[PDB]
Amino acid sequence: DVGTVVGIDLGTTYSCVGVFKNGRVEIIANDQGNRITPSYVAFTPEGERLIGDAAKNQLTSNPENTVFDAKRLIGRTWNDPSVQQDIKFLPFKVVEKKTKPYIQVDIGGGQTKTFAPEEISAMVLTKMKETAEAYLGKKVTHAVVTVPAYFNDAQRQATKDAGTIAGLNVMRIINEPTAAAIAYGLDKREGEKNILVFDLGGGTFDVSLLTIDNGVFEVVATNGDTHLGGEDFDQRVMEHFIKLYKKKTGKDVRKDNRAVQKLRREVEKAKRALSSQHQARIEIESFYEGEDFSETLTRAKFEELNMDLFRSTMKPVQKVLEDSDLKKSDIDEIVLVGGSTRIPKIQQLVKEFFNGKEPSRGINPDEAVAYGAAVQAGVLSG
Numbered sequence: 001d002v003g004t005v006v007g008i009d010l011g012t013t014y015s016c017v018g019v020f021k022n023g024r025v026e027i028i029a030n031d032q033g034n035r036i037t038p039s040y041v042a043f044t045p046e047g048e049r050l051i052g053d054a055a056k057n058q059l060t061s062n063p064e065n066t067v068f069d070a071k072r073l074i075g076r077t078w079n080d081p082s083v084q085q086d087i088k089f090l091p092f093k094v095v096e097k098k099t100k101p102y103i104q105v106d107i108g109g110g111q112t113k114t115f116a117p118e119e120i121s122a123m124v125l126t127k128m129k130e131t132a133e134a135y136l137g138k139k140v141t142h143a144v145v146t147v148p149a150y151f152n153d154a155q156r157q158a159t160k161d162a163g164t165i166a167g168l169n170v171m172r173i174i175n176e177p178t179a180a181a182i183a184y185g186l187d188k189r190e191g192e193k194n195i196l197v198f199d200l201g202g203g204t205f206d207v208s209l210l211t212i213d214n215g216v217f218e219v220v221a222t223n224g225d226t227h228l229g230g231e232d233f234d235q236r237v238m239e240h241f242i243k244l245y246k247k248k249t250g251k252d253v254r255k256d257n258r259a260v261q262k263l264r265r266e267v268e269k270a271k272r273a274l275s276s277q278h279q280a281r282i283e284i285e286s287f288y289e290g291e292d293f294s295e296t297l298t299r300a301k302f303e304e305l306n307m308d309l310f311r312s313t314m315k316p317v318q319k320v321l322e323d324s325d326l327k328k329s330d331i332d333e334i335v336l337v338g339g340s341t342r343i344p345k346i347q348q349l350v351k352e353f354f355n356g357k358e359p360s361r362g363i364n365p366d367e368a369v370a371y372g373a374a375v376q377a378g379v380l381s382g
């Protein structure tokens with residue numbers, strides 16, 4: 001009666017949905033043709049509600065009515081010190097309502113609306129739901145959904161509630177690092193094994209030490225940095241090009257938030273290309289004052305601008321090993337997770353840290369969590 005159940009990675013920055021079909025996990029592309037979807041919502045002045053790529057890609061000078069980063073607020077109270085810190089950096093309004101940080105926005109024509117963070121995530125979940133239904137050709141009603149291993153009782157319940165709002169029965173909440181391990185068939189291993197999961201995404205860096213003992217996972221320790229991710233690498237590159245643009249002209253880009261957002265979208269794309277190529281062209285017609293932008297970024301310059309942030313990832317790996325009473329030698333499996341682990345330098349740094357030990361390979365790191373959830377959803381489907 002559960003039909004075809006879906007596996008959903010609900011990411012801070014990008015979400016992914018898979019399903020088990022004809023004996024194999026399929027990761028599903030959304031209606032813009034992408035296998036990941038921005039965890040973003042926007043509201044046009046005409047009152048259209050946009051979700052995903054359409055919402056992130058919308059140029060506007062009104063960043064107040066775009067909503068993202070709801071995973072930082074979900075399941076948490078208004079007065080939670082972490083909420084109070086995060087709202088300093090968010091461009092949308094957050095207000096105390098019913099003990100919680102509600103998001104307040106203009107929904108169209110000056111009509112204000114407030115949304116609990118789970119109602120925001122419910123919109124993202126609706127989008128993932130729609131993505132799977134278009135693929136399957138039928139309605140979907142049940143889901144496996146992942147959360148970071150450190151999520152507490154309230155954050156897990158609020159993720160289920162988001163499902164409920166979206167019409168999804170969330171049958172199982174699984175930990176993200178565990179789903180990635182499952183994607184790589186690591187639960188099948190025989191005896192006891194120590195697994196380090198290094199997960200570097202868009203907004204966050206999570207390191208997890210897991211133990212597997214005949215198909216039973218244990219989260220032994222977690223560490224990382226909740227404000228370190230792919231978005232931070234983008235910002236270093238933006239700073240670089242804004243600085244260069246000023247010097248080469250005399251103009252300061254930053255007065256035009258449409259211009260900044262244009263450069264952001266393009267810098268993001270180039271960074272992705274530099275995981276595959278050694279140079280990438282950034283170009284924006286009518287960039288600033290109707291003047292056109294064209295520059296090139298090398299992989300080497302990308303690495304140089306970010307090297308300190310890249311190296312900073314090793315400290316939490318050290319701490320995790322310490323708190324687990326383990327040394328590097330005690331690690332039997334290394335699992336790379338998150339879109340930022342596609343960056344060659346990040347893969348090089350992790351390998352060197354583990355004295356040349358190769359990590360698991362073969363599943364896209366930004367899809368491995370969804371893949372593991374789909375693996376479980378396949379058993380639950382029938």
Ligand SMILES: Nc1ncnc2c1ncn2[C@@H]1O[C@H](COP(=O)(O)OP(=O)(O)NP(=O)(O)O)[C@@H](O)[C@H]1O
Pocket residue numbers: 009010011012013014015036200201202203204205229230231268271272273275337338339340342343365366
């Ligand atoms: N090929 C690539 N090369 C470099 N970066 C990439 C590549 N592909 C995706 N990314 C980045 O991966 C980041 C998103 O990672 P992803 O794991 O998909 O997000 P998430 O699941 O929301 N993780 P999180 O933001 O930490 O909650 C974004 O900053 C992307 O720009």
